[PDB]
Scaffold this active site. Structure first.
Site, PDB file in Angstrom:
ATOM      1  CD  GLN A 244     -41.287 -95.584  43.146  1.00  0.00           C
ATOM      2  OE1 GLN A 244     -41.043 -96.347  42.473  1.00  0.00           O
ATOM      3  NE2 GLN A 244     -41.471 -94.044  42.680  1.00  0.00           N
TER       4      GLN A 244
ATOM      5  CB  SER B 225     -45.414-102.825  47.392  1.00  0.00           C
ATOM      6  OG  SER B 225     -43.999-102.713  47.131  1.00  0.00           O
TER       7      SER B 225
ATOM      8  N   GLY C  63     -42.299-105.783  45.621  1.00  0.00           N
ATOM      9  CA  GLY C  63     -41.148-105.185  45.264  1.00  0.00           C
ATOM     10  C   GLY C  63     -39.964-105.967  46.079  1.00  0.00           C
ATOM     11  N   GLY C  64     -38.953-105.909  45.373  1.00  0.00           N
ATOM     12  CA  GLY C  64     -37.748-106.738  46.276  1.00  0.00           C
ATOM     13  C   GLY C  64     -37.234-106.090  47.527  1.00  0.00           C
ATOM     14  CB  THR C  65     -36.768-102.280  48.437  1.00  0.00           C
ATOM     15  OG1 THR C  65     -35.585-102.421  47.533  1.00  0.00           O
ATOM     16  CG2 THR C  65     -36.451-101.725  49.785  1.00  0.00           C
ATOM     17  N   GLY C  66     -39.295-104.027  49.447  1.00  0.00           N
ATOM     18  CA  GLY C  66     -40.450-104.342  50.055  1.00  0.00           C
ATOM     19  C   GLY C  66     -40.569-105.695  50.795  1.00  0.00           C
TER      20      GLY C  66
ATOM     21  CB  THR D 182     -46.598-103.516  37.856  1.00  0.00           C
ATOM     22  OG1 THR D 182     -46.281-103.536  39.275  1.00  0.00           O
ATOM     23  CG2 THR D 182     -47.910-102.923  37.729  1.00  0.00           C
TER      24      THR D 182
ATOM     25  CG  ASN E 125     -52.319-100.346  43.845  1.00  0.00           C
ATOM     26  OD1 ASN E 125     -52.602 -99.909  44.942  1.00  0.00           O
ATOM     27  ND2 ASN E 125     -51.263-100.424  43.328  1.00  0.00           N
TER      28      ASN E 125
ATOM     29  CD  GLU F 228     -59.016-101.276  74.034  1.00  0.00           C
ATOM     30  OE1 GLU F 228     -59.838-102.046  74.153  1.00  0.00           O
ATOM     31  OE2 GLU F 228     -58.697-100.060  74.104  1.00  0.00           O
TER      32      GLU F 228
HETATM   33  N1  LIG Z   1     -50.981 -97.678  46.125  1.00  0.00           N
HETATM   34  C1  LIG Z   1     -49.801 -97.548  45.626  1.00  0.00           C
HETATM   35  N2  LIG Z   1     -48.896 -98.373  45.270  1.00  0.00           N
HETATM   36  C2  LIG Z   1     -47.874 -98.145  44.608  1.00  0.00           C
HETATM   37  C3  LIG Z   1     -47.369 -96.994  44.458  1.00  0.00           C
HETATM   38  N3  LIG Z   1     -46.023 -96.961  43.849  1.00  0.00           N
HETATM   39  C4  LIG Z   1     -45.765 -98.522  43.730  1.00  0.00           C
HETATM   40  N4  LIG Z   1     -46.848 -99.241  43.996  1.00  0.00           N
HETATM   41  C5  LIG Z   1     -46.856-100.760  44.201  1.00  0.00           C
HETATM   42  O1  LIG Z   1     -45.640-101.275  44.285  1.00  0.00           O
HETATM   43  C6  LIG Z   1     -45.702-102.429  43.947  1.00  0.00           C
HETATM   44  C7  LIG Z   1     -44.356-102.971  43.421  1.00  0.00           C
HETATM   45  O2  LIG Z   1     -43.368-102.802  44.467  1.00  0.00           O
HETATM   46  P1  LIG Z   1     -42.065-101.732  44.012  1.00  0.00           P
HETATM   47  O3  LIG Z   1     -42.657-100.457  43.360  1.00  0.00           O
HETATM   48  O4  LIG Z   1     -41.302-102.378  43.353  1.00  0.00           O
HETATM   49  O5  LIG Z   1     -41.221-101.320  45.549  1.00  0.00           O
HETATM   50  P2  LIG Z   1     -39.944-101.915  46.006  1.00  0.00           P
HETATM   51  O6  LIG Z   1     -40.039-102.708  47.420  1.00  0.00           O
HETATM   52  O7  LIG Z   1     -38.814-100.661  46.390  1.00  0.00           O
HETATM   53  O8  LIG Z   1     -39.245-102.972  44.785  1.00  0.00           O
HETATM   54  P3  LIG Z   1     -37.851-102.161  44.034  1.00  0.00           P
HETATM   55  O9  LIG Z   1     -38.200-101.111  43.240  1.00  0.00           O
HETATM   56  O10 LIG Z   1     -37.469-103.340  43.096  1.00  0.00           O
HETATM   57  O11 LIG Z   1     -36.784-102.171  45.051  1.00  0.00           O
HETATM   58  C8  LIG Z   1     -46.646-102.421  42.724  1.00  0.00           C
HETATM   59  O12 LIG Z   1     -47.397-103.501  42.682  1.00  0.00           O
HETATM   60  C9  LIG Z   1     -47.322-101.040  42.676  1.00  0.00           C
HETATM   61  O13 LIG Z   1     -48.835-101.417  42.831  1.00  0.00           O
HETATM   62  C10 LIG Z   1     -47.925 -95.866  44.637  1.00  0.00           C
HETATM   63  O14 LIG Z   1     -47.698 -94.774  44.714  1.00  0.00           O
HETATM   64  N5  LIG Z   1     -49.257 -95.996  45.451  1.00  0.00           N
HETATM   65 MG   LIG Z   2     -37.413 -99.766  45.063  1.00  0.00          MG
END
Ligand SMILES: Nc1nc2c(ncn2[C@@H]2O[C@H](COP(=O)(O)OP(=O)(O)OP(=O)(O)O)[C@@H](O)[C@H]2O)c(=O)[nH]1
Ligand SMILES: [Mg+2]
Ligand SMILES: Nc1nc2c(ncn2[C@@H]2O[C@H](COP(=O)(O)OP(=O)(O)OP(=O)(O)O)[C@@H](O)[C@H]2O)c(=O)[nH]1
Ligand SMILES: Nc1nc2c(ncn2[C@@H]2O[C@H](COP(=O)(O)OP(=O)(O)O)[C@@H](O)[C@H]2O)c(=O)[nH]1
Ligand SMILES: Nc1nc2c(ncn2[C@@H]2O[C@H](COP(=O)(O)OP(=O)(O)O)[C@@H](O)[C@H]2O)c(=O)[nH]1
Ligand SMILES: [Mg+2]
Lengths: 55, 427, 48, 430, 427, 430
Positions: free
Chosen positions: D11, D131, D134-137, D170, D197, D245
């Site tokens: 996300q 991110s 996140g699990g996917t991140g 979060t 953030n 560079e």
């Molecule tokens: N700057 C910014 N950070 C975001 C936004 N949305 C989510 N985050 C950050 O994303 C972090 C968590 O990662 P996730 O939102 O769970 O993304 P993910 O890798 O898809 O994890 P899953 O949803 O479990 O699959 C949080 O710490 C948020 O601060 C956004 O729109 N802008």
């Molecule tokens: Mg996700």
């Protein structure tokens, strides 16, 4: 995104209830409740006059 | 495409579920006759979560209704949304409930279980995807307490991966409506601990207390109480149905909140609640929502958080809001009350936001927490179970159904072990 | 009734004022670079 | 000509990418459909007639975020194959997004990125967004870098990741997910930038007067850095800086690659009315701890090499004077085995002003990418958080249940320990 | 942004407080329905000090009303400005007052204490900043004296830094409305000395004397007397609400007037008070205010300053006026009457000027002074307390609640020592 | 060009300042909005417009005084950053304004003053205003000077303070704050000027004809002296005096710096119908004790070096005759080791009048800065008042509770005693 940021947010945004029972306050809102029986008085008068006829 | 299967067992579960579908049908805009006449396209994006479509634009919920006697079934049939349910999904016996846990689990449960499971299999196999199951039942009764656990074991056997989230109502501490509750609850706990992934406990007494302290309700019937519970059900699954800035589904909630396999019993709450007439004086903002959520009086279970300590907590937000405002509030409430949170877990408060709030409200929130205060409730039932069991007393009515006395001893032993486990991690 | 003991409150006030407790406490906070196990294996891993 | 590929994961990646492609299409003059009412080819492919298609791949294991774009205004902009969605998300579980769920969709992802690279005659790098919590991140992001390393080898793989904030959090399992992903990042990534953030929130409130930011506001600021970062390949200037560079100039060693970012000026319309914002002012604003997009005090550590990028009517004489002034600050510490200390960049294309934006029209703007030992504070913060949970085995059962082996938890703790050693050893006296 | 929380205790507190909000609402221009219909922009500058807003442009004061029996509030709510207050800030018991300090402190105080504190917590933590609290109560009663002091300790424990300003009415010497007043006042002082920062002493007899001497009111009622008290409360916080040439808030007053922690009791007075027929003769000048403020008859406390000596003095002036003329008067009144001032503190008169005057007046002034004449008021009730205590009088009523007899001895010893403390510093 | 920076502290400093800036903007010909219907560079900066901006910083710990400027007519002239307001004032407590509340905002302000000095290419000094009795004026002013001393070092920091009056007093704790502040002032300040309200009341009623003054009339008189002091750097003159010249000529030693002020002619102008006000007339009017802005008679003491500033039609021939006459006067003393005793300057631009004015538009005027031993009278009174309160420790508990240690009370009391004999030894001759 000005609506969330603005400080007149409390001023401008319309309040949550209007006179009797607002038409936009649906059941899912969880503000329309049934426990305030505002017909309690009329039911009470009817019941005794029903008891009066019985007596 | 994260469909959820709903099951209603017993009088308490059935009537709560009947009110529960009114809340959803209003939120999505589905007629009692199963027609869509709504107002927004976003309602039709992921209606598939709870409903099936019959050819002709008629939407039918994924509901399975269970009872041992048809008494409550006819009440639901005559209800306002009675036409909605699928007529073949009504499964019932022809014998009295008996209010006996052994009778419900063993005598009549076996005959009804084989029919109930295949009806479930019809809906569970009919959809493209299946995330978890949804059960509503009470723990002090005879049908829900016994047959609900029986079905929960079978659902675990057939669907090991899926989340078995259940919603339970706990017998009240002061006045309760059944003589033999301590037997029923102690027996049921053994199954729920090992089988269900998520269990939410709700007490009748707190629901009355919420009605009078906040809502001021002069004559709160069971409709108002069922209203309060169904909101929390709607709040949890809303992340599946509508978009938002930060999605958080059931399995995210389980992973974050549950540190150990057995500590997964939860207390719930909702905000805001309209003190009718009074809230013209109240300004609803994000910080005000937080104040009610972490206020002890708004919790729906009669266990005081302040007498224990928190382990995990989670809050959802519905509506358009600032994301920084939510994240700062969780930091604020966690720092100001350090005594109530554990040190060896940093950042004890999880947060989530969803964009579409319930109709009419600018914002609303839901609170789910896990705390060691549950030791108060389990001590209550254990103490009553102990002094009834010493005299033997009503065990005469459970023996003639085929339940061994060792089952009482095993049930207490597992329950007490749960109590000590909550004590130890307080250190 | 028992009469109060005569006490020179001006002398006690003279002495007490230097002893007044400060309102706001100070906070020098350690940096996590100062960690006792910086760059080395934590001891608890073997038990785990 | 010269090309770069953008991949968004999770996300936090795709939601930033939505704002980025809004800014890029507006800058070049392409309507949201992909037609016109130059440097187009470094970011877009011309299918023919008058239509353009971006070089982007959107990936997340749950369909909610992607379906927003599929139903949004930009649906015709992208190739439907580019928009990739799973069935059920990783539930913030690293093992779930790496072993069970991730492997079901990884090979589909690799075909489309490889198919996208064939049309790219002169590709020179990748841009990938995570991110950490996140699990996917983290779970899926780790699997992607591991495969791309053998798929493409000596091609610069640059990353733009959200650093877990010191206090704002979060996810409760957030420290667990970051360390496991850090092990995979450190060996394969060419260079991975840090933003968080918590600092962006405070910056969005102080410099810009946005009291109550959302995720939408923060995405635009990140979009401007990437626009400034890639502008050297697109528009004309006086000192061009290629991706390669960055790899040599910023990182002195292999494992110390993580930089931090800064941008200046960020100013509301009614504050810039009083400020000229010439070259000297914008250079000074970069080095204040307030403007850093990672909430770590640079005064805690020391500075190694920095890279500076200018967009506007900037004269080289003023650039040398400003950096000469920056060397005169005794509050700024540099390491003496980096006496050079700087690389400069100048370009003529001014910042782009999105309608309804939160940013004032500034005639020159400067972007800073800097590598410092101050971030050693942040790893020690994250390392401590992991220890408290793992001392009592706080969340091991969820990970083990999804194919994860427990033996990797101490090994990941070992690798972070070496990384922490590497910083104090680098930052140590000459 | 220096928000103030207002607390009213007892029949005296609720009646005085209700009249107090009538004064401020007119001054700022808030319609009794709670909406702004004012006439100047300066009114909306710093209304945040006393009011919160509800969504929809309605302002609600930061008021908490406390009593043991619900008789007084329903009289207050039925008043014209009753709708202004938030309904949920009304905290009452279902038991009689009893006119008993021990009963208020121990039996009924504990039950209401927990409920009241969370109501305070709502208003205290709903604002960006908090400077102090504001208590209005009487000392001769049982609810204001008893529960007021108990709440005073809890406020100090939770919020040590904030200023706990209290306004008190002292039982009258000649005719008083309660037999057991010496018991209630003697016990009450021990809590006030150690916990409260600032205390103002008002005597009902002086209020009557001012009404008949100056205002020539043929039949004054409690409305007239309470109106005079309301002006002083409005005057002190006026520096917070409106701009001025020289600002002086609550914390400045405590720093200057209080030389030692235990000497913080004050007397107050207000000028100009004009008779109906004297208005045509009285030319309003700055010297005219100076004569009234330092005149002994204008003192609202029935303790004569001439019988003692001054330690500190403070005067506020409201309106657009000369800074030279005010400063010259302070020097003139100080040098002319040097026999009533202490040598070891020069410049005993503090001064301040505010810009916007109260409704209906062009120039107005407020006086707060600290002097040794309070030994008159404490000697009076000590003399009555001793004779009622030498023989055991009504005492058995207090013992049957839980109060130990040694508390009376502690109460007198602490109170007697405060009398001696003022005796020593007179030298 | 050459620049001077103004810093204003407390209610006195801020609302004196807006009196000063209404004078300068009217003098240079700048409308309140910064537009126009030279010497602008000394006090103002130009932006990318026809708009100007003052080089000033307003500081106070409570928002009421500053917010009056924010909603006033002059709000558009100042940069929003320049107006700094705290949350809750110091309550006339030096300790509260120095340790507890002072440190909450000190570093925020120091960035803003330093940032303004970057735009000042030819910075030569600062101007700082105080009121001694106020908590913010003395407490936060001491903290500001201590930091500023190490920040800039060898730059001339001039101060313009209001000495507490001999008998007029508005704070009971007033003597405590002045002596504690005097410790910090004496070591760090380059030179500071004394005036007091009681003399300014008397002059404004006697010389100027006003029955009832306010602080507004007094604040305008102070602005004229600062206007005449700074006129040398701005407009042409036959004898220019820079800030650094004042530092060397006036002060014979480090600790004896404190001069006093005077100005002539101060006249309600209907009285100016009768007289031509030649150079000899205005020179004689300076030396009468009635015209001193500090209510101490020089006849009790002696004169060290004095500085004279003439504005307008004055001619160098007439100056020499006038000062020669004042040397013959046997009501005026000079110490033996200062036979020269004078520093003179002439500027051509006459003073500027203001709408709603108080003074005349006379064609010539003179300003004086004199260092005299008569100031030792003021120190004896303040010291005496301090000892009365401190013997019984009348207000120590408030200070100690707010971070102050008691040992600072006697040590600050010792240094003033040394200063008291510093003045007595210098007053002797050999
Ligand atoms: N700057 C910014 N950070 C975001 C936004 N949305 C989510 N985050 C950050 O994303 C972090 C968590 O990662 P996730 O939102 O769970 O993304 P993910 O890798 O898809 O994890 P899953 O949803 O479990 O699959 C949080 O710490 C948020 O601060 C956004 O729109 N802008
Ligand atoms: Mg996700
Ligand atoms: N000449 C002149 N003096 C002033 C003015 N305003 C205040 N003063 C003097 O300032 C002295 C006291 O200092 P304060 O006004 O309290 O200033 P402060 O430092 O802000 O005090 P705090 O409120 O604690 O912050 C008094 O002696 C006044 O005479 C003014 O406008 N003009
Ligand atoms: N909230 C709620 N509780 C109910 C309702 N009806 C019954 N209960 C409670 O449910 C508890 C046990 O229900 P029971 O009839 O034994 O369910 P059974 O197990 O199916 O027999 C009783 O203590 C009731 O108080 C209802 O409509 N709403
Ligand atoms: N000034 C003033 N005094 C009052 C008022 N009402 C009651 N009192 C006085 O307050 C004293 C005690 O009041 P009480 O009834 O005991 O209040 P309680 O604290 O609720 O018990 C009596 O002597 C009354 O004379 C009022 O409206 N104004
Ligand atoms: Mg101030």
């Amino acid at each position: 995104e000005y609506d969330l940021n603005r400080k007149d947010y409390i001023k401008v945004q319309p309040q949550m209830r209007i006179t009797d029972n607002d038409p936009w306050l649906s059941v899912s809102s969880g503000l329309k409740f049934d426990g305030e029986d505002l017909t309690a008085e009329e039911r009470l008068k009817a019941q005794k006059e029903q008891r009066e006829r019985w007596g | 495409v994260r469909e959820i299967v709903h099951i209603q067992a017993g009088q308490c579960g059935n009537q709560i579920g009947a009110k529960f579908w009114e809340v959803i049908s209003d939120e999505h805009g589905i007629d009692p006759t199963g027609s869509y006449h709504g107002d927004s396209d976003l309602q039709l994006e992921r209606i598939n979560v709870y409903y099936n479509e019959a050819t002709g634009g008629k939407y039918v919920p994924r509901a399975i209704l269970v009872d041992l006697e048809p008494g409550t079934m006819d009440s639901v049939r005559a209800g306002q949304f009675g036409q909605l349910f699928r007529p073949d999904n009504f499964v019932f016996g022809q014998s009295g409930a008996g209010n006996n846990w052994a009778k419900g689990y063993y005598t009549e449960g076996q005959e009804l279980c084989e029919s109930i499971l295949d009806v479930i299999r019809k809906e569970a196999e009919s959809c493209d995807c299946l995330q978890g199951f949804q059960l509503v039942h009470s723990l002090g009764g005879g049908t829900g307490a016994g047959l609900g656990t029986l079905l929960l074991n079978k659902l675990r056997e057939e669907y090991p991966d899926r989340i078995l989230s259940t919603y339970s109502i706990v017998p009240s501490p002061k006045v309760s409506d059944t003589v033999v509750e301590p037997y029923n609850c102690t027996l049921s706990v053994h199954q729920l601990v090992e089988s269900a992934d998520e269990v939410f406990c709700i007490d009748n007494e707190a629901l009355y207390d919420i009605c009078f302290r906040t809502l001021k309700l002069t004559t709160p019937t069971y409709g108002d109480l069922n209203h309060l519970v169904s909101m929390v059900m709607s709040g949890t699954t809303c992340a599946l149905r509508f978009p938002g800035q930060l999605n958080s589904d059931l399995r995210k909630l389980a992973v974050n909140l549950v540190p150990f396999p057995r500590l997964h019993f939860f207390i719930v709450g909702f905000a805001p609640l309209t003190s009718r007439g009074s809230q013209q004086y109240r300004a609803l903002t994000v910080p005000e929502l937080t104040s009610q959520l972490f206020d002890n009086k708004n919790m729906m279970a009669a266990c005081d958080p302040r007498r224990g300590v928190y382990l995990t907590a989670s809050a959802h937000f519905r509506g358009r809001m600032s994301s920084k405002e939510v994240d700062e509030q969780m930091l604020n409430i966690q720092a100001r009350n350090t005594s109530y949170f554990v040190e060896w877990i940093p950042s004890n408060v999880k947060s989530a936001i969803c964009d579409i709030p319930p109709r009419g409200l600018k914002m609303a929130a839901t609170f789910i927490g896990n705390t060691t205060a549950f030791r108060e409730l389990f001590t209550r039932v254990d103490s009553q179970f102990q002094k009834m069991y010493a005299r033997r007393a009503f065990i005469h009515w459970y023996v003639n159904e085929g339940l061994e006395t060792v089952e009482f001893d095993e049930a207490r032993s597992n329950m007490t072990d749960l109590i000590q486990e909550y004590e130890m991690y307080e250190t | 009734m028992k009469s109060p003991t005569k006490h020179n409150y001006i002398l006690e006030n003279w002495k007490q004022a230097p002893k007044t407790k400060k309102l706001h406490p100070e906070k020098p906070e350690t940096w996590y670079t100062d960690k006792p196990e910086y760059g080395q294996v934590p001891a608890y891993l073997d038990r785990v | 000509m010269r090309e770069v590929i953008s991949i968004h994961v999770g996300q936090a990646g795709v939601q930033i990418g939505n704002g980025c492609w809004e800014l890029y299409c507006l800058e070049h003059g392409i309507q949201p459909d992909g037609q016109l009412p130059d440097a187009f080819n470094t970011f877009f492919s011309e299918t023919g007639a008058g239509k353009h298609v971006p070089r982007a791949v959107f990936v997340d294991l749950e369909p909610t975020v992607v379906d927003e774009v599929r139903t949004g205004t930009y649906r015709q902009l992208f190739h439907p194959e580019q928009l990739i969605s799973g069935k059920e998300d990783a539930a913030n579980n690293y093992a779930r997004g790496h072993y069970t769920v991730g492997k079901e969709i990884i090979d589909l992802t690799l075909d489309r990125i490889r198919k996208l690279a064939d049309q790219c005659t002169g590709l020179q790098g990748f841009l990938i967004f995570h991110s950490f919590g996140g699990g996917t991140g983290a779970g899926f992001g780790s699997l992607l870098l591991e495969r791309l390393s053998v798929d493409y080898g000596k091609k610069s793989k640059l990353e733009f990741t959200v650093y877990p904030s010191p206090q704002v959090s979060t996810a409760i399992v957030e420290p667990y997910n970051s360390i496991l992903a850090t092990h995979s990042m450190i060996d394969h990534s060419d260079c991975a930038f840090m933003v968080d953030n918590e600092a962006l929130y405070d910056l969005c409130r102080r410099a810009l007067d946005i009291e109550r930011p959302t995720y939408t506001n923060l995405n635009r600021l990140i979009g401007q850095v990437v626009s400034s970062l890639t502008a050297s390949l697109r528009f004309d200037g006086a000192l061009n800086v290629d991706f390669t560079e960055f790899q040599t100039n910023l990182v002195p060693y292999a494992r110390i690659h993580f930089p931090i970012c800064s941008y200046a000026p960020v100013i509301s319309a009614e504050k810039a009315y009083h400020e000229q914002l010439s070259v000297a002012e914008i250079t000074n604003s970069l080095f204040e701890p307030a403007n850093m997009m990672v909430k770590c005090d640079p005064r805690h550590g020391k500075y190694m090499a920095c890279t500076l990028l200018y967009r506007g009517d900037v004269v080289p004489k003023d650039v040398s004077a400003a950096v000469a002034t920056i060397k005169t600050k005794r509050t700024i510490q540099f390491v003496d085995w980096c006496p050079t200390g700087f690389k400069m960049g100048i370009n003529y294309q001014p910042p782009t002003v999105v309608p309804g934006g939160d940013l004032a029209k500034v005639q020159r703007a400067v972007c800073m990418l800097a590598n410092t030992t101050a971030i050693a504070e942040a790893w020690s913060r994250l390392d401590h958080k992991f220890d408290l949970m793992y001392a009592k085995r706080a969340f091991v059962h969820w990970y083990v249940g999804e194919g994860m082996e427990e033996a990797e938890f101490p090994e990941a703790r070992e690798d972070l320990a070496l990384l922490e050693k590497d910083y104090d050893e680098v930052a140590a006296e000459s």
